[PDB]
Amino acid sequence: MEKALKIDTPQQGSIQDINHRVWVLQDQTLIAVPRKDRMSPVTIALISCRHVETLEKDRGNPIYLGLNGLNLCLMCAKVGDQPTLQLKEKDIMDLYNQPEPVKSFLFYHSQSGRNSTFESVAFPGWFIAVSSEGGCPLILTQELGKANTTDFGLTMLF
């Protein structure tokens, strides 16, 4: 069970509100559709990792998030070259329910001036990119040349 917090309840909402970038799971990949007739709204569920007792603390607080609709959540994968995101098949309420804080799916949450960032716990050095620039797919980046969006908020509701 959790220690003593006031944000244990799952907070589900969205991120499209940032720049009208709707997110759609398309052919096992999340892609932003900022201008498409075939768009589909989704939801983003965010919850703390109650089994943080065995996790790191120095680097920052690891938590988990997922899409609410087709049973899909963040998941680190590798293209046999470098790490990548795979939000397709994963459950968030399960990792919360059972003491299985799988770092490969957890992300350290941070903030830097009204902005929030999320770094891969199993593989630090990379940040999730919300893709609010042109309309790129949801991927992880380690360094960007002001071409992606790593620094942003969320529109999670409770």
Swiss-Prot record:
One of its GO terms (biological process) is inflammatory response. It holds the Pfam family IL1. Expressed in immune system and fetal brain, but not in other tissues tested or in multiple hematopoietic cell lines. Predominantly expressed in skin keratinocytes but not in fibroblasts, endothelial cells or melanocytes. Increased in lesional psoriasis skin. Its main location: cytoplasm. Induction: By Il-1 and TNF-alpha. Keywords: Cytokine, Cytoplasm, Immunity, Inflammatory response, Innate immunity, Nitration, Secreted. It is found in: Cytoplasm; Secreted. GO terms for molecular function: cytokine activity; interleukin-1 receptor binding. Residues 1-5 form a propeptide. The modification 3'-nitrotyrosine is found at residue 96. N-terminal truncation leads to a dramatic enhancement of its activity (>1000-fold). It comes from the Eukaryota. One of its GO terms (cellular component) is extracellular space. Belongs to the IL-1 family. PANTHER family: INTERLEUKIN-1 FAMILY MEMBER, INTERLEUKIN-36 ALPHA. Cytokine that binds to and signals through the IL1RL2/IL-36R receptor which in turn activates NF-kappa-B and MAPK signaling pathways in target cells linked to a pro-inflammatory response. Part of the IL-36 signaling system that is thought to be present in epithelial barriers and to take part in local inflammatory response; similar to the IL-1 system with which it shares the coreceptor IL1RAP. Seems to be involved in skin inflammatory response by acting on keratinocytes, dendritic cells and indirectly on T-cells to drive tissue infiltration, cell maturation and cell proliferation. Initial experiments using non-processed full-length protein found in vitro activity only in the ug range. This is Interleukin-36 alpha.
